[PDB]
Design a protein around this ligand. Structure first.
Ligand SMILES: [Cl-]
Ligand SMILES: [Zn+2]
Ligand SMILES: [Zn+2]
Length: 193
């Protein structure tokens, strides 16, 4: 099956705790963006934190576009935005094609720098390891997972942990924002294992 790298991005949004020194334009931006559920979604919008989602989507797009620069293709991805116990964060799965594991660190470092400039007005987020490549173990190699990781680990999340998801993988397009479809794929995954 298709192989992917996973980068978890903790989403900064608090001007005191995460982004000291940022201008008013940040709060104005995240406060003014209205989100609507697509017709095919069955999510409860009241459980979705829009200001954080606004930052998350921008991070996702900037990350992917920068990744495409390195992969030199429209890389396949599955990105899931979640409200964790400590941080809102993105599980960013991007296919390995065109990106060697030894150079991934430098690439992701460059992507982080781009995020700081574009999304955060040059302000460094005060969150520990806010852009982290998932490793096999501490100090180990960059973890590589296949498509199965999606239905096995990401699709099972429900609201409010699950906040939103995006993908250009046809197999998961419907599942991204549909709990019933996620339920179907999770069931299918268990049956096959
Ligand atoms: Cl967390
Ligand atoms: Zn591809
Ligand atoms: Zn998570």
């Amino acid at each position: 099956m298709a192989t992917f790298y996973e980068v978890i991005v903790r989403v900064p949004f608090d001007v005191e705790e995460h982004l000291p020194g940022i201008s008013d334009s940040f709060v104005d931006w995240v406060t003014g963006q209205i989100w609507e559920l697509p017709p095919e979604s069955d999510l409860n919008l009241t459980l979705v934190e829009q200001p954080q989602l606004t930052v998350a989507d921008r991070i996702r797009r900037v990350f992917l576009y920068e990744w495409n620069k390195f992969s030199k293709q429209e890389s396949k991805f599955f990105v899931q935005f979640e409200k964790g116990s400590e941080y809102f964060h993105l599980h960013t799965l991007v296919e390995t094609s065109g990106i060697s594991s030894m150079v991934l660190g430098r690439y992701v470092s460059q992507i982080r720098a781009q995020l700081v400039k574009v999304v955060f007005q040059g302000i460094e987020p005060q969150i520990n390891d806010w852009v982290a490549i998932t490793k096999v173990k501490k100090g180990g190699a960059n973890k590589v997972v296949d498509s199965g990781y999606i239905p096995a680990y990401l699709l099972p999340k429900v609201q409010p942990e699950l906040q939103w998801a995006w993908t250009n993988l046809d197999e998961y397009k419907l599942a991204a924002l549909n709990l019933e479809e996620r339920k179907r794929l999770v069931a299918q995954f268990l049956a096959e294992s």
